[PDB]
Short mmCIF file of C-alpha atoms and ligand atoms in Angstrom, two decimals:
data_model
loop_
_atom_site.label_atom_id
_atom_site.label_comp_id
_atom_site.label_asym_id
_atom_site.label_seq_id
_atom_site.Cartn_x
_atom_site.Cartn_y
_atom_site.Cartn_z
CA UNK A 1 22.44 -37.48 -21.25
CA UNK A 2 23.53 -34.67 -23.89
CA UNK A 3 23.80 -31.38 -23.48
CA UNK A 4 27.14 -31.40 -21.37
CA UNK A 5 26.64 -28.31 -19.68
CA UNK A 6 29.18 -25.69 -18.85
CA UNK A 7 29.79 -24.42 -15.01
CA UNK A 8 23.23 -17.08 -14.21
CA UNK A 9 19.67 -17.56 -14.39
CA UNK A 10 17.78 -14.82 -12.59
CA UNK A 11 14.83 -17.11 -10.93
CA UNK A 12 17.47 -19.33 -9.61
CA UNK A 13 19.29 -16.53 -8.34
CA UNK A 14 16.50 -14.12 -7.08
CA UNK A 15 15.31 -17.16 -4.87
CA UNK A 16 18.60 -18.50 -3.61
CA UNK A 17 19.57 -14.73 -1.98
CA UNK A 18 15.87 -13.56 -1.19
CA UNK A 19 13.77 -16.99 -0.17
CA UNK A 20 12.81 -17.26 3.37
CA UNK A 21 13.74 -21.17 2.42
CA UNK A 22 16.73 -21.53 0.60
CA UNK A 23 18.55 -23.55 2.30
CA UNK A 24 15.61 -26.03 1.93
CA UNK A 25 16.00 -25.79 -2.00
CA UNK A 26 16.88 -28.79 -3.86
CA UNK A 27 20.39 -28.94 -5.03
CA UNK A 28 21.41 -27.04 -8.23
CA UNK A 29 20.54 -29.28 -10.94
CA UNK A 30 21.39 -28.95 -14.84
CA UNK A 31 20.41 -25.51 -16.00
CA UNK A 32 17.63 -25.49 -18.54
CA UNK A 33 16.95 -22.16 -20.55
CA UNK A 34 13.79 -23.05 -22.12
CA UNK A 35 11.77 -24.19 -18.91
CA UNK A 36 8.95 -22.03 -18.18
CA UNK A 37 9.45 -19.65 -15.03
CA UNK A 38 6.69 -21.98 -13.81
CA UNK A 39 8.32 -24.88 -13.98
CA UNK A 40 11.51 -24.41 -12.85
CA UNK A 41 9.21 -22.71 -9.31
CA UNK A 42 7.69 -25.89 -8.99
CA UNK A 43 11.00 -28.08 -9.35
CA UNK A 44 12.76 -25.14 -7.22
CA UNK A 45 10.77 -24.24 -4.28
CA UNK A 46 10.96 -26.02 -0.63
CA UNK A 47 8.40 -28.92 0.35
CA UNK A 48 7.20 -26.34 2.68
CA UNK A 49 5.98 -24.23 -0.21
CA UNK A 50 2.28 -25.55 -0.68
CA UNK A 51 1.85 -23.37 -3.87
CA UNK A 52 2.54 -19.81 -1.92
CA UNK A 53 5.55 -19.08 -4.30
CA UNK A 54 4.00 -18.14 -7.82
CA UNK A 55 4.15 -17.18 -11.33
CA UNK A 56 2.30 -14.06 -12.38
CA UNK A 57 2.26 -11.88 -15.65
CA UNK A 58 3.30 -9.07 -15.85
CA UNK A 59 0.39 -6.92 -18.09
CA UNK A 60 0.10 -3.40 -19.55
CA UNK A 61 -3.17 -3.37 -18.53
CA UNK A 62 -5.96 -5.32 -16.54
CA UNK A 63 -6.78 -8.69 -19.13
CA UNK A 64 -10.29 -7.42 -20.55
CA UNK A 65 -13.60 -8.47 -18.82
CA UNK A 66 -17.26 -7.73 -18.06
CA UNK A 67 -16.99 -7.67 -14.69
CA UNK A 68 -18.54 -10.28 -12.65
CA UNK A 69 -17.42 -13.44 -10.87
CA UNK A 70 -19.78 -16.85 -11.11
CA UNK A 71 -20.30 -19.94 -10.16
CA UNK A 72 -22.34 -22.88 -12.89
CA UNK A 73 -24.74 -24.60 -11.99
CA UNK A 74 -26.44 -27.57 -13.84
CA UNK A 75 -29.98 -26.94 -15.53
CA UNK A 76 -33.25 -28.88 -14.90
CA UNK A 77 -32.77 -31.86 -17.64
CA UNK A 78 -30.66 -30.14 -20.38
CA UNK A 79 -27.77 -32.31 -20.79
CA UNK A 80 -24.88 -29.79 -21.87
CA UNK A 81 -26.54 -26.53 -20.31
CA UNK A 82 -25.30 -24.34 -17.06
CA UNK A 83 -26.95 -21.50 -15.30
CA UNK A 84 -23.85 -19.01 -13.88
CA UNK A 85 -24.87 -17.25 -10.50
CA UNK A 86 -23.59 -13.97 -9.94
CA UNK A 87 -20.84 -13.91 -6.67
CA UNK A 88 -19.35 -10.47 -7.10
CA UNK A 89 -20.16 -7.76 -9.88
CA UNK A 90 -16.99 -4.95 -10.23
CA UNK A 91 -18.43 -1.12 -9.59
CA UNK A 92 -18.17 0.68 -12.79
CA UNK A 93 -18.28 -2.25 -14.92
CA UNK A 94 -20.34 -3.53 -17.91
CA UNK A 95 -22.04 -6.12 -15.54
CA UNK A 96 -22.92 -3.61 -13.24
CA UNK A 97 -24.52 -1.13 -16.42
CA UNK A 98 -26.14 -4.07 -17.60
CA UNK A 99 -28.43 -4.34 -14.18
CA UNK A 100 -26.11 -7.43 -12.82
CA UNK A 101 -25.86 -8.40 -9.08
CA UNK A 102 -25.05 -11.02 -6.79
CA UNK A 103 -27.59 -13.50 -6.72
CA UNK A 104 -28.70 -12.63 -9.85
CA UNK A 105 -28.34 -16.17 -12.37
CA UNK A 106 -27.63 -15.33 -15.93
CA UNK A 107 -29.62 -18.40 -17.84
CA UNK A 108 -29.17 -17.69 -21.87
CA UNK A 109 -26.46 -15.51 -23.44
CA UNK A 110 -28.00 -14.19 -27.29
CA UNK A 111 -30.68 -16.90 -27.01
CA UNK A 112 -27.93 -19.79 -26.47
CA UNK A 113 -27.48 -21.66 -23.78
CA UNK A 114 -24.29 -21.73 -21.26
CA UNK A 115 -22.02 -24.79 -21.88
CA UNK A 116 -18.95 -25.83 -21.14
CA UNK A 117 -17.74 -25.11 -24.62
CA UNK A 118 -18.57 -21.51 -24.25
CA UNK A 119 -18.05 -20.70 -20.55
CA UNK A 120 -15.33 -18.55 -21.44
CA UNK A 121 -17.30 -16.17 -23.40
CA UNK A 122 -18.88 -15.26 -19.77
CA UNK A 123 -15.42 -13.27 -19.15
CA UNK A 124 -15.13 -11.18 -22.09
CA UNK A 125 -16.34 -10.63 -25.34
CA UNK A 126 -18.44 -8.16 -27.66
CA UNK A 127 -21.88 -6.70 -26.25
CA UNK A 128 -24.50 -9.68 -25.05
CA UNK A 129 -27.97 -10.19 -24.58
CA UNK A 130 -29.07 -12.01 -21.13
CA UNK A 131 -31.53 -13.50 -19.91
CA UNK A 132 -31.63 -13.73 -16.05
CA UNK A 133 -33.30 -15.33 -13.06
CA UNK A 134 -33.22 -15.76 -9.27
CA UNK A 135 -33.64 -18.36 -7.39
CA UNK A 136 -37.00 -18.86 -5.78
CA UNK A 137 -38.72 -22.13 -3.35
CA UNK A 138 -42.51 -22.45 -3.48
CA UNK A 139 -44.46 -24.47 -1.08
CA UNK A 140 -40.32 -27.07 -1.05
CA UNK A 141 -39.20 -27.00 -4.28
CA UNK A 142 -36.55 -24.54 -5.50
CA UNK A 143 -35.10 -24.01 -8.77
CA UNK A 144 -33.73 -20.79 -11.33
CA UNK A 145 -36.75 -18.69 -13.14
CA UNK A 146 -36.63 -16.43 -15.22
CA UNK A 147 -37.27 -12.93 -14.53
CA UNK A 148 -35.98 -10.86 -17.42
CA UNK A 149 -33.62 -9.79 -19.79
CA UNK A 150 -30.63 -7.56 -20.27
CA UNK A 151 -28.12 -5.93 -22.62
CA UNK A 152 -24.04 -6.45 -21.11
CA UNK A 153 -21.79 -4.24 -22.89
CA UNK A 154 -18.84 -5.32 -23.84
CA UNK A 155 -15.71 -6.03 -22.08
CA UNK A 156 -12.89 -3.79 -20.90
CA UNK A 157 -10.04 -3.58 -18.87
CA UNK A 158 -11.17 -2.72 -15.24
CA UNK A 159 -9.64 -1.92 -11.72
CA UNK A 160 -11.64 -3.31 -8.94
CA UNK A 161 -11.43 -1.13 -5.89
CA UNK A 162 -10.86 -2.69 -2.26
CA UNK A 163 -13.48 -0.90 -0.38
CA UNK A 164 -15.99 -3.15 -2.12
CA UNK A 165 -19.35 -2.18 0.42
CA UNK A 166 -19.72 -0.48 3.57
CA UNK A 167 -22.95 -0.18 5.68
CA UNK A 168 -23.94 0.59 9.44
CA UNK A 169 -26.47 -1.83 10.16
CA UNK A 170 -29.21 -1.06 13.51
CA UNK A 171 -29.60 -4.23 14.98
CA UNK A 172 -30.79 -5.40 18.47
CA UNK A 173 -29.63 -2.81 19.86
CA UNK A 174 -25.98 -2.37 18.88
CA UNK A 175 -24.52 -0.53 15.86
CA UNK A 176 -22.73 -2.53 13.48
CA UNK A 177 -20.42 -1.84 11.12
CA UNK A 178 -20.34 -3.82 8.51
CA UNK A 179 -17.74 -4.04 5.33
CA UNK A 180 -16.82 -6.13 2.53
CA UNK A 181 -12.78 -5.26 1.84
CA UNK A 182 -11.60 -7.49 -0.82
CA UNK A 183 -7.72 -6.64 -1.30
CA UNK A 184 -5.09 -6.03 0.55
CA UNK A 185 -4.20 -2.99 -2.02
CA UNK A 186 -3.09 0.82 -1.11
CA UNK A 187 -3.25 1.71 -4.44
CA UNK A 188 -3.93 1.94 -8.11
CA UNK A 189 -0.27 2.99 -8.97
CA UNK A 190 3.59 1.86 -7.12
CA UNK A 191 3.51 4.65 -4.50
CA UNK A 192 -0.82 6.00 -4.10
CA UNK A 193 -2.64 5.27 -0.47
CA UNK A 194 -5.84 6.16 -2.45
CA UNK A 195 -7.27 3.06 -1.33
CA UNK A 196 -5.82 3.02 1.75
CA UNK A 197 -7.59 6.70 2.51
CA UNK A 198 -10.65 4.94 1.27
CA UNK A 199 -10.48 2.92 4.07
CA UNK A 200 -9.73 5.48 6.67
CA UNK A 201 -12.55 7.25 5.05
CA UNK A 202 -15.35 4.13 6.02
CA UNK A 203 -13.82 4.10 9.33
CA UNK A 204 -14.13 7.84 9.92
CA UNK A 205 -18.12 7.33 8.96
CA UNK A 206 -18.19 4.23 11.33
CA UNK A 207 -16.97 5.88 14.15
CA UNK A 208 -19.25 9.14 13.16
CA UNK A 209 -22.33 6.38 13.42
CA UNK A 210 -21.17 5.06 16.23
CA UNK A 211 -20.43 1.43 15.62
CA UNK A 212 -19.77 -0.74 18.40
CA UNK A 213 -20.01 -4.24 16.33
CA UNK A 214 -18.46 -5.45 13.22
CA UNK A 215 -18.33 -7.55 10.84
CA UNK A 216 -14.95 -7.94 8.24
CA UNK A 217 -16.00 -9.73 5.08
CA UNK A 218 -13.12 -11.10 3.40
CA UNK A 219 -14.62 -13.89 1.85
CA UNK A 220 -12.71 -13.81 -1.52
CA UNK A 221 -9.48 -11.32 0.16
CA UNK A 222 -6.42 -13.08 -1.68
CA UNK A 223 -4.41 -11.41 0.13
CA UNK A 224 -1.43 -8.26 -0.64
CA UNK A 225 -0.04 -5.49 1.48
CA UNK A 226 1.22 -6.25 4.94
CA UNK A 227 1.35 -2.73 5.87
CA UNK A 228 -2.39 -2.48 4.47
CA UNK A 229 -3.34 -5.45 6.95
CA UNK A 230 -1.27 -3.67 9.42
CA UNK A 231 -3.55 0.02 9.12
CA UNK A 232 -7.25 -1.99 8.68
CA UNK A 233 -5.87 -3.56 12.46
CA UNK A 234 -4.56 -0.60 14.23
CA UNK A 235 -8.32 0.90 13.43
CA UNK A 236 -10.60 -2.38 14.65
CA UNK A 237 -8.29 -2.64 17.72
CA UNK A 238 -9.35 -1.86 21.27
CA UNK A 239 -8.01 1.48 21.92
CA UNK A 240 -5.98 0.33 24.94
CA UNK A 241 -3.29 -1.66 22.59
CA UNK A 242 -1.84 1.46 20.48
CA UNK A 243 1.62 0.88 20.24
CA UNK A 244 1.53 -2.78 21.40
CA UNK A 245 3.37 -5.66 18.70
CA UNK A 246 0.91 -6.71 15.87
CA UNK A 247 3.10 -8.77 13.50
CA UNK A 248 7.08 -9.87 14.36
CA UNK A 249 8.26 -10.33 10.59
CA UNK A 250 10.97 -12.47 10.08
CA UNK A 251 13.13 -13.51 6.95
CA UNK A 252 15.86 -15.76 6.26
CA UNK A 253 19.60 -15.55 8.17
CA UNK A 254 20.90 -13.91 4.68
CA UNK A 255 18.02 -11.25 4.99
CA UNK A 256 17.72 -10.15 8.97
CA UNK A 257 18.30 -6.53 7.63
CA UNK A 258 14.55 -6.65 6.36
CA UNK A 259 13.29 -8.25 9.74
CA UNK A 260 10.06 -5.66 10.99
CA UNK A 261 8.08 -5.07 14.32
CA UNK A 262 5.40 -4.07 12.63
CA UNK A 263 2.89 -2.28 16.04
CA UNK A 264 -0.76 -1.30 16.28
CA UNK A 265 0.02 2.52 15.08
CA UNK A 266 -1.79 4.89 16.11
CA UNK A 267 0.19 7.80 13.24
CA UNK A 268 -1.10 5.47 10.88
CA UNK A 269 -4.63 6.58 11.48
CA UNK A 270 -4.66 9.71 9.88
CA UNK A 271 -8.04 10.97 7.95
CA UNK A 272 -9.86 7.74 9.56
CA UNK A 273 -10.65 6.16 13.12
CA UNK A 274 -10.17 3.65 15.56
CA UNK A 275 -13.20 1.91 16.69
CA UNK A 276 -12.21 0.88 19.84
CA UNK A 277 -13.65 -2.85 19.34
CA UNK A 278 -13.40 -5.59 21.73
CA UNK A 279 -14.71 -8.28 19.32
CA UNK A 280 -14.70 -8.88 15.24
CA UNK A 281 -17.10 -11.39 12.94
CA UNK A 282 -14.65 -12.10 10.29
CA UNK A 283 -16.47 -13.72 6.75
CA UNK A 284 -14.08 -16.08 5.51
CA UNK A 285 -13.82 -18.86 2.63
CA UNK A 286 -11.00 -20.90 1.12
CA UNK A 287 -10.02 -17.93 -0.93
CA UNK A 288 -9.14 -15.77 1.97
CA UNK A 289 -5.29 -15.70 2.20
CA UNK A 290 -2.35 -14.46 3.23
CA UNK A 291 -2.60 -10.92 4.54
CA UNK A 292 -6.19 -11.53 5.19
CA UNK A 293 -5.19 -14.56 7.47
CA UNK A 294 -2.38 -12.16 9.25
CA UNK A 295 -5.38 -10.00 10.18
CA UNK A 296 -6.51 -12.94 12.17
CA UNK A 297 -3.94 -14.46 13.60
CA UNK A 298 -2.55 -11.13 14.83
CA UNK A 299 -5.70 -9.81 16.26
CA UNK A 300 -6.43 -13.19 18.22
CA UNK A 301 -4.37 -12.48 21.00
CA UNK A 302 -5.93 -9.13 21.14
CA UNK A 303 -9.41 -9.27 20.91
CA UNK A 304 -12.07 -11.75 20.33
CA UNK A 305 -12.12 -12.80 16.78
CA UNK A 306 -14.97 -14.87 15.44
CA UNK A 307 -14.77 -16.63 11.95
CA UNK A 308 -17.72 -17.43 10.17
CA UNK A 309 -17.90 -19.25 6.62
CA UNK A 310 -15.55 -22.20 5.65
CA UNK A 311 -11.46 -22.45 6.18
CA UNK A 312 -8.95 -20.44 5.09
CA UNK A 313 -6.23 -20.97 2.41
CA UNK A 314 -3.27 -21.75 4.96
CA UNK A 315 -0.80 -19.29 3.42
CA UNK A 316 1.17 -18.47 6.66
CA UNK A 317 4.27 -16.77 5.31
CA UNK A 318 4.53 -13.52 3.32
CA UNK A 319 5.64 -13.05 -0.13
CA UNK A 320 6.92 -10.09 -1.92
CA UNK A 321 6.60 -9.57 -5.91
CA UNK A 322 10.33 -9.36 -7.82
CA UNK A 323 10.48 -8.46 -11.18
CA UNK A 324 12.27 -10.30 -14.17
CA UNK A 325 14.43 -7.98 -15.44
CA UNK A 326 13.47 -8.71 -19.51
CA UNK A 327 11.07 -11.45 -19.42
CA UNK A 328 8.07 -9.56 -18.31
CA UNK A 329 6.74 -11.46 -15.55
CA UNK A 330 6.71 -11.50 -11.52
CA UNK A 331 8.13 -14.22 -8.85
CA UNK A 332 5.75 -13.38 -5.97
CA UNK A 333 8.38 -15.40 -3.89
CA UNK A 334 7.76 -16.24 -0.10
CA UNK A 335 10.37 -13.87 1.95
CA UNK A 336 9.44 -13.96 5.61
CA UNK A 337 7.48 -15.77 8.02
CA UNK A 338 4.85 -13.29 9.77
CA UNK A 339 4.14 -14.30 13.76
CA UNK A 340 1.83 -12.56 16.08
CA UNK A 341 2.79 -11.24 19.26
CA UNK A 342 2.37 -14.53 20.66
CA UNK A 343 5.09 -15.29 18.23
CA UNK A 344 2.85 -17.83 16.39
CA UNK A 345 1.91 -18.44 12.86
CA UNK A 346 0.41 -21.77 12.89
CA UNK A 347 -2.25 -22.04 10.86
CA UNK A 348 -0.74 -24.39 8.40
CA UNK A 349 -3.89 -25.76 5.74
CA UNK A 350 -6.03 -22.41 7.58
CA UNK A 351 -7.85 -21.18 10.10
CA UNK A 352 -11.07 -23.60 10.72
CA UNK A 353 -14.12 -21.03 11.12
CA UNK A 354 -15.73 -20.87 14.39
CA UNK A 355 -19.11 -21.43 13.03
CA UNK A 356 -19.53 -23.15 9.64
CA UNK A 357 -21.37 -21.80 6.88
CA UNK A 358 -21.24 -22.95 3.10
CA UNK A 359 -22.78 -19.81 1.11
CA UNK A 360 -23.13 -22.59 -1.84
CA UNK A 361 -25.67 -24.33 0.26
CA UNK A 362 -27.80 -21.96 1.38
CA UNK A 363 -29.02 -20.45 -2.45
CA UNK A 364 -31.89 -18.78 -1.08
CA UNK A 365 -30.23 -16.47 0.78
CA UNK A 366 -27.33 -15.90 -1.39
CA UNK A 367 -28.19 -12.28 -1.73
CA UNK A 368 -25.93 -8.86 -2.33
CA UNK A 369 -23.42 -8.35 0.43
CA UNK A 370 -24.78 -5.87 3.34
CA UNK A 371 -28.11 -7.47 2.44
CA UNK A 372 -28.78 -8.57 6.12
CA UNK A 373 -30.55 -11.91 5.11
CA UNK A 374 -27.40 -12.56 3.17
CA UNK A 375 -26.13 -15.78 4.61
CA UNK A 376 -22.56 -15.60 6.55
CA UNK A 377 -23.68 -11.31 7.36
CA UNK A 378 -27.19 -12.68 9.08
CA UNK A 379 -25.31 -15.76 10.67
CA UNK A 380 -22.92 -13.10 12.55
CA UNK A 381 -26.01 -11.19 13.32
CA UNK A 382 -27.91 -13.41 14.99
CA UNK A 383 -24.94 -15.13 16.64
CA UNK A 384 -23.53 -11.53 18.42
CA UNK A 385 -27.49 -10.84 19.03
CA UNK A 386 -28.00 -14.81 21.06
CA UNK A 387 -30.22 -16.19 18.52
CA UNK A 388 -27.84 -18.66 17.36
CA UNK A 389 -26.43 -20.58 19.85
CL1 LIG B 1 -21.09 -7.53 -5.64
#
């Protein structure tokens, strides 16, 4: 109606020279200045875009927390109560001073129950008291008790590190390495491989021990760094394919400067090892995206890749953070598709595990990761060893 616009925005502009789909954007419409960044992405972005494009902040510093993830979990006839089972506890954090692991429930927070009105207080806050349980059948009937108590201290900002666990695990006879990388980060700062030389360093002690099994959990990997995916598979590869095509990236016809053949790379190695695999277990879950799915599809045509856990996010195209120039936050826009050497990428709505396994439904074995009785690591186990079919 009114405004009668006039015939300069940056997110418009950004995306129509850098988007892997422009030409697939709707038409230009009437500007609108007060629109939220996220709304004019959702209005903006191809059909194609199933929520790949996004919206983040840009912060000072990490947003404050204690240091766990969790999941709730109704308790035994209290209408408005929850009991919040550990899934992943950040090293160095308050959670992890406190006594706090996966698998461990916590029941009472200052002798209140968890509700849905205060939920939020489980992510940050002043010091708390716990209470905590586990969950435990008798003989079947299984349910949350309580095993003790604990003082949290209080939140800060923290920086979770990749290289989340690593362990060589004995078992039937083969030497399995097993570890739990959870971002595709090389990193703390713009321009440090500290994490990345984290990683060499776990493969240089895998190949020191000998591994000739492994197991890649990357159950809650959102995703990141393409040449990070790129390093972790030069050093699971079979030593025969150095040098051979990994990932053909491709952008839009306005951007074939930044097209890459990205190869397995042996110079890339460094400080750690290749392992000279011929098969991978790969943990996976609805969270595992993006680079973590390139790690799969671009090992598939190399080696035998098994997937164990439940499907992956479907995030088959890469995107690469750009900077508002003022307004303080980041378009993580999609730039380029990423094929394998096959020249495939399609794994539209993810990959569908080889063998299923719901961690949720098995809460007697959900257990700290490395434990071997945890659920998707002892479901790998036995299927490499014959004992599941
Ligand atoms: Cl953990």
């Amino acid at each position: 109606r009114w405004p009668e616009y006039y015939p300069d925005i940056w997110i418009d502009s950004v995306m129509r020279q850098e988007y892997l789909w422009y030409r697939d954007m709707p038409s230009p419409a009437a500007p609108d200045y007060f629109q939220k960044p996220e709304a004019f992405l959702k209005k903006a972005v191809a059909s194609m875009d199933n929520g790949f494009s996004k919206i983040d902040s840009l912060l000072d510093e990490p947003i404050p927390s204690y240091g766990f993830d969790y999941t709730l979990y109704k308790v035994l006839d209290n209408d408005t109560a929850y009991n919040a089972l550990i899934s992943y506890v950040v090293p160095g954090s308050p959670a992890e001073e406190a006594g706090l692991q996966r698998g461990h429930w916590i029941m009472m927070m200052n002798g209140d129950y968890i509700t849905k009105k205060v939920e939020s207080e489980l992510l940050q806050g002043s010091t708390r008291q716990l209470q905590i349980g586990v969950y435990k059948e008798v003989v079947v009937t299984g349910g949350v008790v309580p095993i003790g108590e604990t003082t949290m201290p209080a939140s800060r900002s923290l920086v979770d590190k990749p290289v989340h666990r690593f362990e060589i695990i004995p078992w039937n006879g083969k030497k399995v390495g097993y570890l739990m990388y959870n971002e595709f980060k090389a990193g703390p700062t713009t321009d440090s491989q500290a994490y990345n030389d984290d990683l060499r360093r776990a493969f240089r002690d895998f190949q020191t021990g000998g591994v000739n099994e492994f197991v890649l959990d990357l159950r809650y990997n959102t995703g990141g760094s393409l040449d990070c995916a790129q390093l972790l598979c030069t050093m699971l590869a079979p030593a025969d394919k150095m040098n051979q095509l990994l990932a053909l990236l491709r952008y839009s016809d306005k951007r074939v400067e930044a097209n890459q053949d990205l190869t397995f790379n042996p110079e890339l190695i460094q400080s750690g090892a290749n392992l000279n695999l011929s098969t991978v277990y790969v943990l996976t879950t609805n969270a595992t995206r993006g680079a973590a799915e390139m790690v799969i599809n671009c090992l598939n045509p190399y080696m035998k890749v098994v997937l164990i856990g439940t499907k992956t996010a479907g995030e088959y195209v890469a995107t690469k953070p750009f900077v508002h120039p003022t307004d303080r936050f980041i378009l993580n826009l999609v730039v380029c598709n990423v094929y394998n050497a096959e020249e495939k990428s399609d794994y539209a709505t993810g990959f569908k595990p080889t063998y299923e396994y719901n961690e949720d439904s098995y809460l007697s074995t959900y257990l700290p990761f490395g434990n071997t009785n945890e659920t998707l690591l002892n479901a790998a186990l036995k299927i490499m060893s014959g004992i599941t079919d």
